[PDB]
Symmetry: D3
Subunit: 271 residues, 6 copies
C-alpha cells in the first residue's frame, strides 16, 4: 500500500481566485500533475475534505475536472466548506463507493493490509464537526466485525481538541464518541484529518491522530490568539505506506525547491 493524501483543496469557480488573490485552481492543478509525475506511484489518492470553498456548483465543476485528471483511484470525503448534495452529484462518479445518499457518505476499503474507513464529519449549517448516530454505529460495526486487521479512519474534522485556538472550537463536537471507539478497539490505530491546514499529530492509546497541511494555503497553530489567520507557508501532502507491520506516513513537499543533489563524502568533509 502506497497512498498519496492531500486535503483542503478549496477549489473556486473557473474565473476565480481564493480571497481574490490565491490561485487555488492553478496550485491544485500543479499538485495534480506532481502526483501523476511521481516515480513511485500511489495505489490511490485521498482528499480529506474542504474540496471546494463555497459549496457552489461551479467550484465542483472545476474540482471534477482537476481531481478527475488524477491518474489514480480517488477516495474523497467532504468538509464543512462542501455541500453534501453537490459533492455527491459532482464527485461520486470519481469515488463511486460513497453511495447515493448524500447524508450517509461512507466507505470501507480492504484491498490492503490495513482497513481504510472514510467518513463524513461535516454538518450542514456549521463549521463544527459532528459524527451522526449512523456514522458512529457503522464505524463500530467495521471495527467489531473486523477482527485483528488494523484500521485507519479518514475524516475531515479532528476528533479531539489540539490546543489550536482558531481550530479547536470547530473540531468534531462529539469526537469523544470516536475516542470511545479507540479505547474499545485495539485494531483502530490511525485517524487522519483535514480541517486544520497544518501538520499536527498526537496519540490516544494505540491510535496516532494527525491533521494534514492544505494543498495551498495553511493555518498557523496559535495557542492563545483567536484571530483567523491563514498564510502561504509551504504546502505538502502525506504519503502513507505499509512497511511490513508498520503504517508509515511521510511528508511529501509540494513546493518547487532546489535539488536534489547527491551526497559525496569528499564534498561533505573536505581535507
Amino acid at each position: 500500500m502506497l497512498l498519496a493524501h492531500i486535503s483542503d483543496t478549496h477549489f473556486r469557480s473557473r474565473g476565480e481566485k481564493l480571497y481574490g488573490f490565491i490561485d487555488v485552481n492553478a496550485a491544485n492543478a500543479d499538485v495534480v500533475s506532481q502526483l501523476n509525475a511521481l516515480r513511485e506511484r500511489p495505489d490511490a489518492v485521498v482528499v480529506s475534505g474542504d474540496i471546494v470553498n463555497c459549496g457552489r456548483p461551479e467550484e465542483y465543476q472545476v474540482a471534477r475536472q482537476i481531481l478527475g485528471s488524477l491518474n489514480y483511484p480517488l477516495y474523497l470525503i467532504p468538509g464543512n466548506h462542501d455541500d453534501k448534495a453537490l459533492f455527491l452529484e459532482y464527485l461520486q462518479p470519481l469515488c463511486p463507493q460513497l453511495g447515493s445518499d448524500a447524508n450517509n457518505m461512507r466507505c470501507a476499503v480492504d484491498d490492503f493490509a490495513t482497513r481504510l474507513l472514510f467518513i463524513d464529519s461535516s454538518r450542514a449549517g456549521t463549521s463544527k464537526g459532528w459524527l451522526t448516530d449512523e456514522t458512529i454505529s457503522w464505524l463500530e460495526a467495521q471495527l467489531f466485525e473486523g477482527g485483528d486487521k488494523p484500521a485507519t479512519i479518514f475524516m475531515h474534522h479532528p476528533p479531539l481538541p489540539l490546543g489550536n485556538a482558531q481550530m479547536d472550537p470547530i473540531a468534531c463536537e462529539n469526537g469523544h464518541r470516536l475516542l470511545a471507539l479507540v479505547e474499545r478497539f485495539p485494531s483502530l490505530t490511525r485517524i487522519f484529518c483535514g480541517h486544520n491546514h497544518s501538520l499536527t499529530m498526537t496519540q490516544y492509546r494505540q491510535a496516532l491522530i494527525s491533521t494534514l497541511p492544505g494543498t495551498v494555503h495553511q493555518v498557523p497553530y496559535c495557542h492563545a490568539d483567536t484571530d483567523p489567520y491563514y498564510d502561504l507557508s509551504p504546502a505538502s501532502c502525506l504519503m502513507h505506506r505499509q512497511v511490513g507491520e508498520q503504517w508509515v506516513s511521510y511528508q511529501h513537499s509540494l513546493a518547487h525547491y532546489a535539488g536534489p543533489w547527491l551526497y559525496d563524502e569528499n564534498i561533505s568533509c573536505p581535507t
Copy 2:
C-alpha cells in the same frame, strides 16, 4: 510545556558552506533568530543530533556561538556526524545535564507533566545507530521509577525501519532494544528522532515515533531508489505542547513565506 524541537543543524566551520554551497551557518542563525522572535515562547529548545557536519573543533565553535545565542535552556544530543568528546567539551556548558562522560551522555528532565529522556544513539566509526546496554538499563530504571507518569524519548536515530531506502540501512541497528521497552512500559508514549531529515511518523503500540525535518537541507523518502539524495525543500521544526493530557506536536515552518492574512467571510465567498 512548550518545546521547540530542531535537528540536523550540520554546522560548518566559520567561512565554510555545506558541500561548498549550502550556507548552513547562516540558515541556522536565521532559525535561532526565528526561535527568539516567537510570540508563544517555548520553555526550552531541543536539538536532536548532527549538530556539526564533520565532528571538527572549529564547527563546534560555530555551533557553540550560534546555539548559545538562543534565549532558552537547551537540550542537546549527538548524531553520527558528531564527535562525542568534542560535543561534550564545547556543548556541555550549553546543556550541563549531559555530564562529564562523553560515552554516557544522557539526562532526564522532570520539570513537566511528561518526563523527557535524552539519549545518545550515535556510535563511533559508523553512520548506524546503537543503543548500548548502559543506555537501555538507564532507560529501564527511569521508566520503572517514573511509574504512571508519561515519558518521551529524544534520540538521533529512529529505532525501526521506516521503508526509506537511503535511511533504513543506517537507522538504529539494534532498535529492537527500544521497541522492547515500549512493549514493557505503557508509560513510554513518544520517541522523537533526527537523522532522516524528513517528517516521517509511525506508531508502535502506545508510542508515536517520529523523525524530524532538518533545519536546512532535507532528504527525500524513496522506497526503491538507493541514491544518497538531499535537497533544499522547505525546512521546519516541531513544536511540542502539553495540552491537557495530550502531548501535541505541530509543524512550525522555518521558511519565509507570504502572510498571514485574516479570514473574512465576504472575501471568502463573494456574492
Copy 3:
C-alpha cells in the same frame, strides 16, 4: 488619526490582466487583505485615483467588489484613467461624500485634528491634470473659512513639475493656482498625489508635497529619458498618522518579505 493611503490600483475587468501579464486584480486583492489584517488599524483608507485602467464598467465592477471588501471607510478620488460618470455610478456608494455630480466630486473631512480635502484633478480627454474654476474656489473657501486648523489635500495629479521626464508633461497643468493657495494659506501643509507611481517628495513654503507608489506596477523617475517605462519594483503605501502637532507619513511595504526577527545585542555584536 491613522490613514492607509494607496494609489493607482488600475483594476482590469474580471478575466483580464494589465498589459496581459500583470495580475493587478489579484495584487490589489492581496493589498486589501493586507490592510484588513493590520494590527494597528487605520480609521480610513484613501485611494488617490487611477482606480481602473480603461474607464470601463467591467473594471469598475471589479474595483467595487475588491475595494468594497475593505473593512474601513473609504475616500476615493479619480485619476486620468478613470471615467467620471462611471466612477460616480460604481464607487459613490463606497464614498457617499463625493456627491452626485460627476463633474464636481470633492469632499472635506474634519473628523480629525487636520482637515482632509479630496479633489478631482482628472480632465476628460487628456492625461494632464486640471483644477476646475469651481475646484480652485472651493479649495480657497475651505482654507479661508478653516482658520488655523491644518489642512491636507489629496489629488491625483502633482501640482508642480518634479523633473520627471515621463510624468512632468502630464502633471496638473494649472497646478500653479494651487501653489498660489499654499503661498496665501499657512494652514495648507500637505498635498499628496498619485499619478507618478513613485515616492517623490518636495516642499513648497510650509507644504510638503508628495507623490505615492502604485499598489502594483511602478514608474521609475528619469530626468532625461522620455520612454514610457513601467516596472514591477516593490509596491507600498503610505500610512499617515497624527502625532501631536505633527502629521507623519511612513512607507508601509506591500511586498512579501522575510521577517521580522528581534534585535538582540549579543547576536548583533558577538564576542
Copy 4:
C-alpha cells in the same frame, strides 16, 4: 545637483554576516555596483550614518574597501553604531572634509544651489542622538553667513519624535535644538536622517524632515508595539535632485525586480 543618499550600511567584518545571517557586506557591495551603474550619474553619494555595526576596526576595513569602490565623491557621517575615532581613522581619506577632530566631524558643501550641511548626532555610550552646543553654534554661523541660499542638513538621528514606538526613545534627545534653528532660519528647508531604517517624512515650518530606508535590513514602524523588530523588506535609497528652485527627493529601489517594459496604449486597453 544630483545626490544618491544611502544610510545604515551596518558593515560587518570580512567573513561575518549581520546577526549571523544577513549578508550586509554582499548586499552593500551589490548597492555600490548599482550606484556605479546608474545612467543618470550622481555628483556625489551621501551615507547618513551607522556605517559599521559594532564600531570595530575590521568592520571599517570592509567599509573602506566597499565604499572606496564607489566612483563618486562621498559625504560620510557617523551614527550610534559607529565609533568616532575609528570612523575618522578609516573613512576620513574617503571624506577629507570631516577633518582631523573625531569629536567635531562636520562640513559644509557650497558647490550646489542649495548648501549641504553634514553633522554628527552620535553620542558615545548611547543609542540616542545628541547635538552638542559646538554643533549648534557652527550651524548658526553657517545659516547666518548663508543668507537667502537654501540649506539642507544631513544627520543620523531624527530631531523630533515620529511616533515610532521602537525608534522614538532613541531619536535625537535634544532635537529641539535643531527645531529652534528651523524657526530661526527660513533658509533651512530639508533635514534628512538615517537611524529609523524606514522612509518616514514630516514637515516642521518650511522644513521637510525625512528618515531614510537602510541599504539592507529595515525596521517597521509600530506605534504601540515596543519589540525591537527588523525585517528584510525591500531596500532603497533616496535620490536628491535640484529641479529649478525645487529640491526633489525620489525613492530609488535597490531591489532586483522584473522590468522595465514600455507602455503601449493598445496593450493597455485592448479592443
Copy 5:
C-alpha cells in the same frame, strides 16, 4: 538584419492555463512587451510554430491579440499543435505572405543579405513532421534559382534525429529529403526549428541546424528516458543578426533576473 525568434508559445483560450497551472497567455504577453521594449529593435519577429496548444479557435483569438500587439512585422509558421485552416483564418492577417491555401503556407523573404524561407512541416493527425512533395520542390526552386545568396530555413520540426528520446520519434519523418538539399546546395547554411523546447544545435555539411527553447515551458533532453517531461526552466529566445558575412545567433533570456551592473577593474580584483 536583426530578427527576434521565439517558438512554441502554446497559447490557451482566454480563461485558461496550460495544464491548468502554467499561465502561458500571461508569460507570452510579458515576452511580447519585452520584445517591444528592446533598445536594439529587430526588423521582424519569427514564431516557429506550436502557436496554440489545442488547435482551438478561442486559442487563436488570444494568439491574434497578443502576437498582434507586437510592434514588428511577423513571420509565423505552424507546428503539430496548430490547426492549418484556423491558423490561416486567424493569423494570416498578421503574416499575409503565408498565402490563402492552408495546405501550402510558405514564403520567401529577401529584404536581407540572407534569404529567409518559412515552411510548414506540420501534418494533420500526427505529432511527426512531414515535408510535402510541393514543399520539398518549392524549397529546391528557391535554392536552385537563388544563386550564391545564403539561405536560412525556418520550420517547426527538426529535419534529423538529435538523440533526444522524447523528441526524435516525432521529428520530421522525411527530413532526410531536406538534408539532401543541404548536400546539393552550398548556399543553404541555417535551419532553425521549434518543436524540441530546447536549445540543441548540430552541423550537417555547411548547415548549422538548431532547435529553440520555448517562450514558456521547456523539455529536457534525455537520451534514454522516454517519459514525456516538461519543466519551467528559464525561457529565452534567439536573436539572429547579420554581421558582415556571418549570420550570428545569440540567446536572449526572457527571464527576470538581477542586473546588469558595470564591470570595474578595482572591484573585480581588490588589493
Copy 6:
C-alpha cells in the same frame, strides 16, 4: 561520447565574492554537485577558461578543491583571467595532459569518434586572444595526421567577431589563423569558446563556432552599447553528445526551476 562543458567559473579566494556580492565559489560548488548528480553521466567535463578571476594562487586553491571534487576526468584550458604558470602548478594534477610547459599548454584526446583539441588562446598582459605559431603548427600537424576523422577545438576566445560591442574588441585578435585552418581542413567541424558569457553561435564553412554561457554571471550581447555590463541571468552549460555521425550540443540549465511534470493529453486539452 558525452561531455559536460562549462566555462568562466571565475573562482575567487576562500571567503571572497566576485565584485563583493556574487558568490561564485558557492555557485560553482552547486554546479559541481549538479554535474555529479546527473542521471546520464558524462565521460568528461570540459572547462573552457577563466577558471579564476584574478590569477591569484589562493583562487587556484579554491578552483583545485571545487573542480577536484567532480567525479569525472577533466579537460581544462586557461582564459585571460588566468595566470599560465599558476594554472599549471595547481590544475595540471587535475588535467595531466596539459604538460609541464605553461607557455605551450594543449592536448589532443583520441578516445572518442571525434578528436578533441584543447588549446590556450590566452596571452599575458591583455584581455585579447592570441594564437601563437606553435599552437597553429601543432594544430596543422593534428589535423593532417587525423585525416577524415572529425575534430573539435576547445579554446577560450572566439576566433572571429560576433558583433558583440563589448566582446568583439577582446576576441581572439589573430583568429584569422584558425579560420584559415577550417578552410584547409574539412575535418575541423566544431570550435567551442568561453569568454563571451553568452550562448552565441555561427558557422564558418563546415565549422559550427559557439561561445558558452558562464556558470555564474552572464554578459548580455549589445551591438551598439559599449558599457561593460554583466548580469545574473540564468546560468547553463552545454552537453556534447556523439549521436551517430552527428555531434549534437544541447543546453543544460544550471538554474533551480519548477518541474519536471509529465505531459498528459487529457490535461493538455480538456473537453
